[PDB]
């Protein structure tokens, strides 16, 4: 009888599915976690076009497992306590059409035995802290990596060191240390455990998909360090830029988080409303919240200029500078400038034409834009002290201009006629050269 | 953005000042502690005649600090977590007229760096147990002493060993062990932490002031052992007697607490309604509650008789006994007696006149007052077996009286005529001498 | 042994004694958390400070500030050169303030002395806040009045053959009416091409007080830069500063270098 099986539970941790007579006894009601988990189930089931195979690690009394089988999922629940699995099976038998199996076993051994494709979604709620406590953080990171490797999505509720109990002392400094080796992760909620006032965060993690409520797609590779608060995911015709505003440990000062926030926000604003006369990459999706923000854009051909420079690849500096200057002059005509023209913000296509790819540093108002013209000289010099004729003649001409006349329209016009300009080395000069060489050091 | 800073808090311990959208998330609402702390702020600000400088140690999200700056305080809040201070500063910036500064730092180092007069009030709520746990009880006592030394008042909420967590084991037996080296302390409330059913006591502590809601004054010295449940504070024209009914450890049996309670209560009753014919010290303030009671009296000139006896000072036993007997006879005429006439209850002024200074042992009804007359002989003998003529003749005369006639009016009358009384050594006597000598041993 | 006492506010070595246990003597220190205790000056103080804006301590009493410099410090803390510079600055400050130049309001000197370990100077206390604090705590400042008043005092010093080698925000105090004055005279000098370097730093000062110069500050600097170098001095700097609204617009000229050299200087 169910009555007996429930009584023999060491703890009624969860609601007993279909049996509200124990709801008052359950440590956690599970309705809040279930609301969120069913939303994510539906998103992923919609994306894949079918009901999911779900793995429930430390499934306890089966509530999540049965609740998803109720919606058509095929589920396997694992728990190392016989008493818990006895209840899960007795509940499944009351619901014979649910495709639900339960097994006694250890999460560590199950994860080692998993095969990729067997399960689409795994859930691990409030269980990994027990594995941390007995086996340490590094083994848990590897288990969670494998779990992500073999599924399409993982949902974790993770206990945290701020919880007031003795086992909190063995927890990592931040729960994100258990998952940050995985490719994609997002905080999706925080839940009251009824053990204390400290809530547990729930994360959605994937090694195969971008999972954003509006955009759910496989990616084939990703990157953290460009050229660690920013991650880039590459799919067939998209790049998803994912910025963390909220990072663990020291990592971001207040100012840096706000700048992550500012840049991504500014980039979204510009790209959703670009200026006429400028070909901006197209925007497929975007959003922001307290922890992070994201932007999914069309994927552009080419390589990042700084990589080409680092990997000593052959470059046409004329075509790169010409094309970039042309786009900068067109921006300026529409009252836009870019505050940070550097090799890692420039992409060069197969025909050696260049374009900006980060619009975080775009600005709309201001003497000016004289400073930006100055840095652009450094850019030029780093792209190559190092300027042969007629690049040097170009710069010398700019330097002879009154400063109120410095702007990107002028820079471009002089650049186009640089072969006609007088020879800098024939003049006393000589300072423009030394100031940028010191700048280009500085 | 505030949203991001709040999300990055390891814990939302407190209400976020001005932002009730996180009140449901806060571990503690802080309104109960704040009600009490603002009352004490006002009392001390009233006494000093000005807005206060306040130090908030382990200030977390700044709630107490901002709430007091709102009332005109100048505040500095200290916390060792960067995330907490980032939120405090962002909140202060929403309230630019608040004089509020926040710094990342360790309480131990801040206390060492404090200067006397820099802050009037320091608050340390639920933070010292963390310092106990890492550095031990003795270092925390010294830190708290210095904090009291450099401020006018300190408010502490202290965690206690009855809390059910592993760190409770490192706590002192009683939270008062962290503060009882400070001069003045009083329990002002007890608060629910939401971690468990065990509340934390809040103490008001000072090394410079008596801080009683009705009486708020500097003192220039204090004393525990007269001539440890009783403390005396001396200010310019007052003495404040402070009795603990509730003491830590074994210290007071039930009967002793009740006797502390009884004596102070009895003293208040007598002094607020003294008998005509008796100059009683005047009463400036008084009150009692579950933990303790206090009485502020006019300060009397002179020295305590027992000190004079111990420090072998010159005394006039005639004038001391005469003056004391005169006051005892006047009490008796009004139906009052003192149950405990001893050197430590008697004060002697510069002209060698004596008076009682503790009225805890005053009584109003009863064969009697024969026992008291007997002890008074011991008193006499200890003030000096040891009686020369005519003191011995005085006592001998009293002993020849039928016992129903023994009382302080008789004692006084015979004392005044003692030079005329017959010589005891000429009589068989001899017993009155031996009984008191054995009594005076006993 | 100073590690046992350096957390206390005021301390001074007053002697060293033979113990008769060995040839190593024991130092005797006089320590206080409430008073400056110098044989000539014995007064309560109500607050003190080590790091300005750890070999220098400042004590504040009712109408005084006592500057206390350690020449002899524990541990690594001061190299030989640094102790000598502590010694030099305090000595130089005492000399200047006890004999100030006419045309310059110098803070008054109440007491002073030096010995092997340290030196001290007790001065009148000036109203106002240190400029660098105001800058750090983003307080409202009038850069015109600050620069005007400072330049006026620098020009008057120069007329008497005095210059200040280290005009920086932490050496300047600004009163309630936004007038500024120097408060550290350790870096005062009396002889020398010159004072051209000092005029150059003063541009950095200016720029840090705000790359960052709007008109007519930029026009001021541009005018100075067009001057032959033998003409650079604080009298000139002040005169051009007072007429800066009339000077030609720098942005209308090729310039442009004075701007870039100070911006690199102001980084450097
Ligand atoms: C705190 S409960 C959480 C239950 C459930 N996941 C939930 O959040 O509603 C932890 C569960 O994991 C199980 N468990 C703990 N460690 C395990 C392991 N190494 N392998 C399998 N099950 C485990 C326990 O038996 C218990 O049922
Ligand atoms: C439990 S909370 C109490 C917060 C706040 N005082 C209150 O009662 O509302 C303890 C706070 O003290 C801080 N803290 C703990 N030890 C500290 C130390 N040694 N120095 C500075 N801050 C400390 C923690 O960062 C935390 O914000
Ligand atoms: N729209 C895009 N199309 C292709 N690559 C991109 C796009 N946006 C960013 N990247 C790439 O992102 C990588 C590192 O991030 P980022 O700092 O954006 O360059 C580089 O290899 C860029 O080429
Ligand atoms: N009203 C008072 N005036 C002066 N001293 C007092 C007064 N009441 C108590 N004391 C002093 O309190 C000290 C110790 O406490 P007690 O047991 O009250 O004597 C003695 O030194 C007494 O002289
Ligand atoms: N004569 C003075 N009057 C007032 N403050 C002074 C005086 N001399 C130095 N200070 C203060 O000393 C502090 C730090 O030392 P200093 O490096 O001298 O500025 C600053 O807050 C100054 O304002
Ligand atoms: Cl491992
Ligand atoms: Cl967990
Ligand atoms: Cl505590």
Domain locations along chain A: 1-219, 220-300, 301-442
Tell me how close the Cα of C120 comes to any Cα of chain B, in angstroms.
Answer: 21
Report, at the CATH architecture level, how domain C127-268 is classified.
Answer: Orthogonal Bundle (1.10)
**Helices A408-416 and A317-333 sit at what angle, rounded to 10 degrees?**
140
Residue A34: CA atoms inside 13 Å, Cβ hemisphere, count? Answer: 17
Q: Which residues contact A165 (CB under 8 A, 6 or more apart)?
A: A195, A196, B165, B166
Residue A130 CA, closest ligand 1 atom number: 16
**Are B292 and B186 within 8 A, CB to CB?**
yes
C-alpha to C-alpha distance for A343 and A382, rounded to whole angstroms: 9
> Measured in Å, how far apart are chain A's first and last C-alpha atoms?
78
Tell me if B27 and A198 make a contact (CB, 8 A cut-off): yes
C-alpha to C-alpha distance for A369 and C218, rounded to whole angstroms: 16
**Are A321 and A360 within 8 A, CB to CB?**
no
Q: Does B390 sit behind a cis peptide bond, omega within 30 degrees of 0 on the bond before it? A: yes
DSSP bridge partners of B204:
B155, B186
Phi, psi of C121 (to 5 degrees): -145, 125
Phi, psi of C239 (to 5 degrees): -60, -40
Residue C185 DSSP symbol: -
| A205 CB burial (10 A radius; 0-12, 13-18, 19+) | buried
The torsion defined by the Cα of A340, A344, A347 and A353, in degrees rounded to 10, comes to 70
Joined together, the tokens standing for residue A160 give 């945290």
Breaks in chain A after residues (C–N exceeding 2.5 Å): 227, 366, 384
C-alpha to C-alpha distance for A332 and A376, rounded to whole angstroms: 14
> Measured in Å, how far apart are chain B's first and last C-alpha atoms?
78
Joined together, the tokens standing for residue B154 give 């300190």
| A146 CB burial (10 A radius; 0-12, 13-18, 19+) | middle
**Alpha helices, H only, A295-365:** 305-310, 317-333
Query: In terms of Cα–Cα distance, which of B212, B206, B202 is closest to B183?
Result: B206
C-alpha to C-alpha distance for A372 and A378, rounded to whole angstroms: 10
**Helices A391-399 and A408-416 sit at what angle, rounded to 10 degrees?**
140
- One DSSP character per residue, B243-305 reads EESS-STT-S-HHHHHHHHHHHHHHHHHHHSPPTT--PPPEEEEEE-SSEEEEEEEPPPSEEH
Joined together, the tokens standing for residue B371 give 């026992």
Tell me if B4 and A257 make a contact (CB, 8 A cut-off): yes
**Are A441 and C266 within 8 A, CB to CB?**
no
Helix, strand or coil for residue B411?
Answer: helix
Q: What sign has the CA pseudo-torsion A126, A128, A131, A133?
A: negative
Helix, strand or coil for residue B371?
Answer: helix
Which residue has a Cα nearest atom 20 of ligand 2? B106
Strand C172-174 relative to strand C118-124, pairing: unpaired
Alpha-carbon distances, residue A272 vs A230, A235, A334, B155 (angstroms): 21, 21, 16, 55
Say if ligand 3 is within 6 A of residue A296 CB: no
Say if ligand 5 is within 6 A of residue C50 CB: no
Cα angle, residue B264 at apex, residues B263 and B266 outer, rounded to 5°: 65
Helix, strand or coil for residue C128?
Answer: coil
Which residue has a Cα nearest atom 10 of ligand 2? B127
Query: In terms of Cα–Cα distance, which of A133, A131, A108, A122 is closest to A156?
Result: A122
Residue A334: CA atoms inside 13 Å, Cβ hemisphere, count? Answer: 18
Q: Which residues of A touch C267 (CB under 8 A)?
A: 442
**Helices C217-225 and C196-209 sit at what angle, rounded to 10 degrees?**
160
Secondary element (H or E) of residue C59 = strand C56-60
For chain A, state the CA radius of gyration: 29
Helix, strand or coil for residue C121?
Answer: strand
Tell me if C264 and A371 make a contact (CB, 8 A cut-off): no
Method: X-ray
Query: In terms of Cα–Cα distance, which of A116, A249, A256 is closest to A180?
Result: A249
Of A371, A403, A442, nearest to C255 by CB-CB distance is A403
C-alpha to C-alpha distance for A362 and B52, rounded to whole angstroms: 47
Phi, psi of A296 (to 5 degrees): -105, 120
Tell me if C260 and A439 make a contact (CB, 8 A cut-off): yes
Query: In terms of Cα–Cα distance, which of B359, B373, B375, B369 is closest to B275?
Result: B359
Q: Which of A 384-423 lie inside 8 A of C, CB atoms?
A: 399-404, 406
C-alpha to C-alpha distance for B41 and B35, rounded to whole angstroms: 10
Ligand nearest to the CA of B237: 4
Query: In terms of Cα–Cα distance, which of C266, C206, C262, C209 is closest to C238?
Result: C206
Say if ligand 1 is within 6 A of residue A305 CB: no
Phi, psi of C174 (to 5 degrees): -115, 120
**Are A132 and A172 within 8 A, CB to CB?**
yes
Tell me if B25 and A199 make a contact (CB, 8 A cut-off): yes
Task: Answer yes or no: is C95 a known binding residue.
Answer: no
Strand A53-57 relative to strand A74-79, pairing: parallel
C-alpha to C-alpha distance for B418 and B39, rounded to whole angstroms: 61
**Are A164 and A198 within 8 A, CB to CB?**
yes
Cα B303 to ligand 4 centroid, rounded to whole Å: 8
**Are A376 and A342 within 8 A, CB to CB?**
no
- One DSSP character per residue, B153-197 reads EEEEE---TTSSSGGGGGS-SSGGGGTTTSSEEEEEEEE--SSSS
DSSP bridge partners of C110:
none
* B334 Rama class: left (phi>0) / alpha (psi -120 to 50) / beta: alpha
Query: In terms of Cα–Cα distance, which of B334, B394, B342 is closest to B372?
Result: B342
Q: Which residues contact A204 (CB under 8 A, 6 or more apart)?
A: A40, A153, A154, A155, A185, A186, A188, A211
**Are A111 and A146 within 8 A, CB to CB?**
yes
C-alpha to C-alpha distance for B159 and B175, rounded to whole angstroms: 7
Joined together, the tokens standing for residue B421 give 């009384």
Helix, strand or coil for residue A438?
Answer: helix
Residue A159 DSSP symbol: -
Tell me, which fold does domain B301-442 have in CATH? Transferase(Phosphotransferase); domain 1 (1.10.510)
Exposed e or buried b per residue across A371-410, where buried means at least 16 C-beta atoms within 10 angstroms of its C-beta: bbbbbbbbbbbebeeebeebbbbbbbbbbebebeebbbeb
**Are A158 and A122 within 8 A, CB to CB?**
no
Residue A413: CA atoms inside 13 Å, Cβ hemisphere, count? Answer: 9
Secondary element (H or E) of residue A127 = none
Phi, psi of B141 (to 5 degrees): -60, -45
C-alpha to C-alpha distance for B248 and C159, rounded to whole angstroms: 75
Which residue has a Cα nearest atom 21 of ligand 5? C130
Strand B74-79 relative to strand B53-57, pairing: parallel
**Candidates 3.30.200.20, 2.40.30.10, 3.40.630.30, 3.40.50.2300; correct CATH number of B220-300?**
3.30.200.20
Joined together, the tokens standing for residue C40 give 């000539």
Residues A1-219: name the CATH superfamily: Vaccinia Virus protein VP39 (3.40.50.150)
Strand A362-363 relative to strand A337-338, pairing: antiparallel
**Alpha helices, H only, A314-442:** 317-333, 370-383, 391-399, 408-416, 431-441
Q: What sign has the CA pseudo-torsion A19, A25, A27, A33?
A: positive
**Helices C257-267 and C196-209 sit at what angle, rounded to 10 degrees?**
80
Alpha-carbon distances, residue A324 vs A264, A348, A354, A355, B291 (angstroms): 22, 10, 6, 6, 80
Alpha-carbon distances, residue B65 vs A340, B72, B100, B435 (angstroms): 40, 11, 7, 68
Phi, psi of A438 (to 5 degrees): -70, -40
**Are B324 and B355 within 8 A, CB to CB?**
yes
How far, rounded to the nearest angstrom, does the alpha carbon of residue C65 sit from its chain's CA centroid?
14
Ligand nearest to the CA of A138: 6
Q: What sign has the CA pseudo-torsion C59, C60, C63, C67?
A: positive
Joined together, the tokens standing for residue B118 give 């820099």
- Let me know how long chain B is: 442
DSSP bridge partners of C15:
C28
Helix, strand or coil for residue C69?
Answer: strand
Joined together, the tokens standing for residue A147 give 């779990």
C-alpha to C-alpha distance for B271 and C236, rounded to whole angstroms: 83
How far, rounded to the nearest angstrom, does the alpha carbon of residue B100 sit from its chain's CA centroid?
34
Other CB atoms within a 10 A radius of the CB of residue B14 amount to 26
Say if ligand 5 is within 6 A of residue C209 CB: no
DSSP bridge partners of C123:
C65, C109
Say if ligand 4 is within 6 A of residue B342 CB: no
Other CB atoms within a 10 A radius of the CB of residue A337 amount to 22
- Let me know how long chain A is: 442
Other CB atoms within a 10 A radius of the CB of residue C250 amount to 27
Joined together, the tokens standing for residue A1 give 């009888």
Tell me, which fold does domain C46-126 have in CATH? Phosphorylase Kinase; domain 1 (3.30.200)
**Are A401 and C254 within 8 A, CB to CB?**
yes
C-alpha to C-alpha distance for B89 and B6, rounded to whole angstroms: 12
Residue located via tokens 């806060």: B26
**Are A81 and A149 within 8 A, CB to CB?**
no
Longest distance between any two alpha carbons in chain A, whole Å: 102
Residue located via tokens 């007491």: C111
Q: Which residues contact A218 (CB under 8 A, 6 or more apart)?
A: A208, A209, A210, A235
Residue B49 DSSP symbol: T
- Let me know how long chain C is: 268
DSSP bridge partners of B217:
B210
Other CB atoms within a 10 A radius of the CB of residue B442 amount to 8
* B136 Rama class: left (phi>0) / alpha (psi -120 to 50) / beta: left
C-alpha to C-alpha distance for A90 and A102, rounded to whole angstroms: 10
Which residue has a Cα nearest atom 1 of ligand 5? C125
C-alpha to C-alpha distance for A351 and A333, rounded to whole angstroms: 26
Joined together, the tokens standing for residue A321 give 């500078």
> Measured in Å, how far apart are chain C's first and last C-alpha atoms?
39
Experimental resolution (Å): 2.2
Task: Answer yes or no: is C12 a known binding residue.
Answer: no
C-alpha to C-alpha distance for A343 and A440, rounded to whole angstroms: 13
């Amino acid at each position: 009888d169910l009555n007996t099986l429930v009584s023999e539970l060491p703890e009624i941790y969860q609601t007993i599915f279909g049996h509200p007579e124990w709801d008052g006894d359950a440590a956690r009601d599970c309705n809040q976690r279930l609301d969120l988990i069913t939303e994510q189930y539906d998103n992923l089931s919609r994306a894949l076009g079918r009901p999911l195979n779900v793995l429930d690690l430390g499934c306890a009394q089966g509530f999540f497992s049965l609740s998803l089988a109720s919606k058509g999922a095929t589920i396997v629940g694992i728990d190392f306590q016989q008493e818990n699995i006895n209840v899960c099976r007795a509940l499944a038998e009351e619901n014979p059409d649910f495709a639900a199996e339960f097994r006694v076993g250890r999460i560590e051994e199950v994860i080692a035995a998993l095969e990729e494709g067997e399960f689409d979604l795994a859930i691990g709620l409030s269980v990994f802290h027990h594995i941390v406590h007995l086996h340490g953080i590094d083994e848990v990171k590897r288990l969670l990596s494998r779990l992500a490797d073999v599924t399409q999505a993982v949902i974790l509720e993770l206990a945290v060191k701020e919880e007031p109990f003795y086992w909190g002392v063995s927890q990592p400094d931040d729960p994100r240390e258990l998952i940050e080796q995985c490719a994609f992760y997002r905080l999706i909620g925080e839940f009251d455990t009824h053990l204390s006032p400290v809530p547990r965060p729930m994360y959605l993690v994937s090694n195969h998909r971008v999972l954003i409520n509006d955009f759910n797609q496989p990616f084939q590779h990703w990157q953290n360090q460009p050229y660690r608060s920013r991650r880039y995911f590459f799919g067939e015709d998209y790049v998803c830029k994912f910025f963390y505003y909220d990072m663990p440990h020291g990592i971001l000062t207040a100012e840096e988080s706000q700048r992550n926030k500012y840049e991504l926000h500014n980039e979204i604003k510009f790209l959703t409303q670009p200026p006429a006369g400028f070909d901006a990459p197209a925007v497929l999706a975007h959003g922001e919240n307290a922890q992070s923000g994201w932007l999914v854009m069309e994927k552009l051909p080419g390589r990042l200029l700084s990589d080409m420079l680092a990997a000593g690849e052959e470059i046409d500096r004329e075509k790169i500078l010409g094309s970039l200057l042309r786009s900068l002059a067109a921006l300026e005509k529409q009252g836009f400038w870019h505050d940070d023209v550097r090799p890692w913000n420039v992409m060069v296509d197969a025909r050696q034409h260049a374009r900006l790819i980060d619009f975080g540093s775009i600005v709309t108002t201001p003497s000016w834009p004289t400073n930006l013209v100055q840095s652009f000289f450094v850019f030029v010099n780093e792209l190559f002290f190092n300027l042969p004729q007629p690049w040097s003649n170009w710069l010398y001409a700019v330097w002879q201009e009154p400063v109120e006349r410095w702007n990107f329209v002028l820079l471009l016009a002089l650049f186009e006629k640089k072969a006609k300009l007088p020879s800098a080395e024939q003049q006393r000069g000589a300072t423009e050269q030394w100031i940028i060489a010191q700048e280009t050091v500085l």
